[PDB]
Design a protein around this ligand. Structure first.
Ligand SMILES: CCCCCCCCCCC(=O)O
Ligand SMILES: CCCCCCCCCCC(=O)O
Ligand SMILES: [Cl-]
Ligand SMILES: [Cl-]
Lengths: 153, 153
């Protein structure tokens, strides 16, 4: 055969066709608290982000197109009153699994460079954007609902 | 020659011998605010973390051994009153540059898998740990210094 470049295409194909398995495996690794009121939104958001990821890899959306979902996640995490570091952990478990899948395609060093650099841009921006949004929302929350104790003013 | 495995060793060698160039380049890419009181600690911490990174790659320290510096950074970022997302951005610029260097060694797909997985563990844990610490410190700060406005209690 001709063996024409297909690493990105094959990654996206696997993540679409094996989605159930992928999400099931991710479920086994994430940090979720029993009393989190958005407990089941974590799975929904992760499923959606898997689709968004494949769209980004296929050059259909830009990094700015994940900023809305990043803000949505930040709001939900803030309302949940869970350590926002859980989100980083859970995102990283997802990325680790995407990379595990990439390496099963036996990419060359060059194919690694090109595909991994793009995977990195996506997850770096997801995490950056979500924490950025969380910070701003928390700042507004403190200003809205709290006041300094007299002892400190 | 025999061409015995040296990818990790060569990466660490470059980051030690070209440290000045590496930090200088990282300086051109980071987000730093003129009035940040720990402005110059960012460069000091980044220089130190480059050393810690090479120590981790050489199997001299564990991931738990970066938790103290993560907490130190979190405290400084909180005191600085800057968006904690800046830290994520700046860390990611550093990682991007480390990976750029790795790829200049022309690693194989296999060498990529092994070395990149370790680079990922380090930076994933640095970011996770620093945000984890920041969250806890902010929670304590709010409890210590603030009270709910009466309208909301
Ligand atoms: C395989 C999952 C891709 C990465 C998903 C990133 C975390 C989703 C955010 C979960 C939440 O809403 O807290
Ligand atoms: C090439 C630099 C390695 C990554 C450094 C990670 C950021 C250092 C933290 C800076 C700070 O103290 O805010
Ligand atoms: Cl999460
Ligand atoms: Cl920083």
């Amino acid at each position: 055969g001709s063996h024409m470049e297909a690493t990105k295409r094959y990654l996206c194909l696997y993540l679409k066709e094996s989605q159930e398995k992928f999400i099931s495996n991710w479920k086994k690794r994430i940090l979720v608290h029993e009393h989190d009121p958005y407990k089941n939104e974590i799975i929904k958001n992760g499923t959606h982000l898997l689709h968004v990821f494949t769209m980004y890899m296929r050059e259909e959306i830009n990094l700015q197109d994940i900023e809305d979902i990043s803000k949505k996640i930040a709001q939900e995490r803030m309302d949940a009153k869970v350590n926002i570091a859980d989100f980083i952990y859970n995102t990283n478990e997802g990325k680790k699994e995407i990379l595990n899948t990439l390496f099963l395609l036996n990419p060359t060093g060059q194919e690694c460079k090109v595909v991994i650099e793009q995977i990195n841009l996506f997850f770096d921006h997801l995490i950056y954007s979500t924490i950025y949004s969380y910070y701003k929302l928390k700042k507004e929350y403190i200003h809205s609902y709290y006041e300094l104790k007299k002892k400190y003013n």
